[PDB]
Amino acid sequence: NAASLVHQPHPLEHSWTFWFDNPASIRPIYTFSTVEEFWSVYNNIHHPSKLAMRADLYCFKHKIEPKWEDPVCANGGKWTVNFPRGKSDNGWLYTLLAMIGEQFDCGDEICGAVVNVRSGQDKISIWTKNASNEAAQASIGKQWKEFLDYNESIGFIFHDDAKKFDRHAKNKYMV
Ligand SMILES: C[n+]1cn([C@@H]2O[C@H](COP(=O)(O)OP(=O)(O)O)[C@@H](O)[C@H]2O)c2nc(N)[nH]c(=O)c21
């Protein structure tokens, strides 16, 4: 019948899974495939301003696990921005909307995004694949900056560098 005709969900290009890691133990929590489902889920998850300290919240394409060791992420890396503790909610949102909406030019390279809640600063990173494709990675980083109205340099860290050099990994590109 008509019920599902006049209130038809609007499907996204990809399915996305939110994962959480709480203050190899990163649980998935909600998978969505439609706009409706996104908002439903985003409106029942805490925004970064009300997350607990040291929490990580991930939003990755379905079947990409948010781990350096995932074979889609393995040769990839991450653009990172910083915001003050408690002032990262809009950035997170604008980031989610940019990804699920397929707004990035080089959106093929996009794996997902993560907000890291820390005392002092919040960080949001976008994870991509093909770290060695500078042209692509620079496109994404610039464009993210433009989406966010961010006015500072951002950097990109190969997952291979992160794995090897924990604290000490340097940015390979900057935009
Ligand atoms: C994001 N991530 C972090 N780790 C490891 O877990 C640690 C968690 O560090 P953090 O909690 O990201 O920041 P903070 O400790 O400065 O507050 C990192 O230093 C990495 O050693 C990770 N280990 C794996 N295998 N995969 C991941 O995606 C990953």
The reported resolution of this PDB entry, expressed in Å, is 2.9
Method by which this entry was solved: X-ray
* 50 annotated to bind ligand: yes
Ligand 1 atom 12: residue of nearest CA: 116
Q: Are 16 and 32 in contact (CB under 8 A)?
A: yes
Taking the centre of ligand 1 as the mean of its atom positions, its distance from the CA of residue 28, in whole angstroms, is 17
Best mutation site among 57, 73, 116, 125 for ligand 1, i.e. most ligand atoms within 8 A of its Cβ? 116
Residue 78, both tokens: 């991450």
**C-beta neighbour count of 113 within 10 angstroms:** 25
Nearest atom in ligand 1 to the alpha carbon of residue 24 is: 25
Edge-to-edge strand order for the sheet containing 110-117?
Answer: 27-34, 11-21, 56-61, 110-117, 121-128, 77-84, 155-158, 173-174
* 120 annotated to bind ligand: yes
**CA–CA distance, 175 with 169 (Å, rounded to integer):** 17
Domain range annotation of the chain: 1-175
**CA–CA distance, 152 with 82 (Å, rounded to integer):** 9
Burial 132-169 (b: 16+ CB within 10 A, else e): ebeebbbbbbebbbeebebeeebbbbbbbbeeeeeeeb
Ligand 1 atom 20: residue of nearest CA: 166
Please name the residue ranges forming H helices in the chain.
Answer: 3-6, 35-42, 89-100, 134-148, 159-165
Q: Are 73 and 130 in contact (CB under 8 A)?
A: no
Taking the centre of ligand 1 as the mean of its atom positions, its distance from the CA of residue 164, in whole angstroms, is 12
What DSSP line would sit under 8-30, residue for residue? ---EEEEEEEEEEE-----EEEE
Report the run of H or E that residue 126 belongs to, with start and end: strand 121-128
Residue with structure tokens 């995932």? 70
**CA–CA distance, 170 with 175 (Å, rounded to integer):** 14
**What are the pocket residues of ligand 1 if the criterion is a CB atom closer than 6 Å to any ligand atom?**
54, 66-69, 116, 118, 166
* Residue 32, helix vs strand vs coil: strand
* 165 annotated to bind ligand: yes
CATH fold for the domain made of 1-175? RNA Cap, Translation Initiation Factor Eif4e (3.30.760)
Q: Are 94 and 156 in contact (CB under 8 A)?
A: no
* Contact residues for 170 (Cβ-Cβ < 8 A; gap 6+): 157, 161
Sign of the alpha-carbon dihedral angle for 53, 69, 45, 137: positive
Taking the centre of ligand 1 as the mean of its atom positions, its distance from the CA of residue 168, in whole angstroms, is 13
Taking the centre of ligand 1 as the mean of its atom positions, its distance from the CA of residue 67, in whole angstroms, is 9
Residue 85, amino acid: R
* 87 annotated to bind ligand: no
